[PDB]
Amino acid sequence: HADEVWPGLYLGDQDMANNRRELRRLGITHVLNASHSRWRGTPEAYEGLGIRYLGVEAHDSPAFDMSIHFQTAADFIHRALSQPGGKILVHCAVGVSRSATLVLAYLMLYHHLTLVEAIKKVKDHRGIIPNRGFLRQLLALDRRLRQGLE
Amino acid sequence: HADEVWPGLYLGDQDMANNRRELRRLGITHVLNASHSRWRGTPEAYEGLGIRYLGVEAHDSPAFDMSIHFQTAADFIHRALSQPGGKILVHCAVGVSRSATLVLAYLMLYHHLTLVEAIKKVKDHRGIIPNRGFLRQLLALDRRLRQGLE
């Protein structure tokens, strides 16, 4: 699963990072793993897919100062998005804690956004109605309720 | 994982639905499974936890008309939230497709919201900075960037 929270910038999960066919379908060109396991190297499928990787080691603990990676991560995302065709997936191993933090920092550092504006941008773009049929069904309910009879 | 997207209403995942200790900690009183497997019955731990269950059978396909469950699901959520102390978890087996749709329908049917307003309410409340330390770190970056030197 992944959401395009900023043009060319996908905030996704570990399963998406592990899905060779989907990464290919989406045309991902860069992957930023916000929770790289030190005993591992670059994910096996990336070289073939033509994906450039950056693995930052971080624990999802209030005691870990993620600030240490703000610049390097933002610089990497910037390099990826600065080139036409650049599409980057940012993810971590469990939820979106470490990944979302690096994305927000990037938006703040490269697009002049305040933290509140960055949070809004990301949250507004994390979809909750992926099923086109369900969307159609909800829009139908909406018209009925907003308009009433006749 | 779960987000309180409306007072007393948690939109969560299958793992949260399977976590007896966390369901207890949160004081959940009702669970709406938007993707109940017909061969199963009520989740094993719910009776002891004192949790009232509603399992609706639905496939996450554009060919499935989720509308068939809008009223029953909304009525259930309404019953749960109408009683002080009521706390409900709504989830499905894989992401938030079936669950989010029932939550949006409930907000539209019981709180006079348009689909756009309901989507905003839900999206605004799905957290992306669960780590309090990371939040502090981002707020520090934010002050630095907004204010500059001195």
Swiss-Prot record, chains A, B:
<dbReference type="GO" id="GO:0043409">
    <property type="term" value="P:negative regulation of MAPK cascade"/>
</dbReference>
<dbReference type="GO" id="GO:0005634">
    <property type="term" value="C:nucleus"/>
</dbReference>
<keyword id="KW-0539">Nucleus</keyword>
<dbReference type="GO" id="GO:0005794">
    <property type="term" value="C:Golgi apparatus"/>
</dbReference>
<keyword id="KW-0333">Golgi apparatus</keyword>
<keyword id="KW-0904">Protein phosphatase</keyword>
<dbReference type="GO" id="GO:0005654">
    <property type="term" value="C:nucleoplasm"/>
</dbReference>
<dbReference type="GO" id="GO:0045785">
    <property type="term" value="P:positive regulation of cell adhesion"/>
</dbReference>
<dbReference type="GO" id="GO:0006470">
    <property type="term" value="P:protein dephosphorylation"/>
</dbReference>
<feature type="active site" description="Phosphocysteine intermediate">
    <location>
        <position position="92"/>
    </location>
</feature>
<dbReference type="GO" id="GO:0004722">
    <property type="term" value="F:protein serine/threonine phosphatase activity"/>
</dbReference>
<dbReference type="GO" id="GO:0070373">
    <property type="term" value="P:negative regulation of ERK1 and ERK2 cascade"/>
</dbReference>
<comment type="similarity">
    <text>Belongs to the protein-tyrosine phosphatase family. Non-receptor class dual specificity subfamily.</text>
</comment>
<keyword id="KW-0963">Cytoplasm</keyword>
<dbReference type="GO" id="GO:0061629">
    <property type="term" value="F:RNA polymerase II-specific DNA-binding transcription factor binding"/>
</dbReference>
<dbReference type="GO" id="GO:0070062">
    <property type="term" value="C:extracellular exosome"/>
</dbReference>
<dbReference type="GO" id="GO:0004725">
    <property type="term" value="F:protein tyrosine phosphatase activity"/>
</dbReference>
<comment type="subunit">
    <text>Interacts with HSF4.</text>
</comment>
<feature type="domain" description="Tyrosine-protein phosphatase">
    <location>
        <begin position="1"/>
        <end position="147"/>
    </location>
</feature>
<dbReference type="GO" id="GO:0005737">
    <property type="term" value="C:cytoplasm"/>
</dbReference>
<dbReference type="GO" id="GO:0008138">
    <property type="term" value="F:protein tyrosine/serine/threonine phosphatase activity"/>
</dbReference>
<dbReference type="GO" id="GO:0002039">
    <property type="term" value="F:p53 binding"/>
</dbReference>
<protein>
    <recommendedName>
        <fullName>Dual specificity protein phosphatase 26</fullName>
        <ecNumber>3.1.3.16</ecNumber>
        <ecNumber>3.1.3.48</ecNumber>
    </recommendedName>
</protein>
<dbReference type="GO" id="GO:0000122">
    <property type="term" value="P:negative regulation of transcription by RNA polymerase II"/>
</dbReference>
<comment type="function">
    <text>Inactivates MAPK1 and MAPK3 which leads to dephosphorylation of heat shock factor protein 4 and a reduction in its DNA-binding activity. Inhibits MAP kinase p38 by dephosphorylating it and inhibits p38-mediated apoptosis in anaplastic thyroid cancer cells. Can also induce activation of MAP kinase p38 and c-Jun N-terminal kinase (JNK).</text>
</comment>
<dbReference type="GO" id="GO:0004721">
    <property type="term" value="F:phosphoprotein phosphatase activity"/>
</dbReference>
<keyword id="KW-0378">Hydrolase</keyword>
<dbReference type="GO" id="GO:0033549">
    <property type="term" value="F:MAP kinase phosphatase activity"/>
</dbReference>
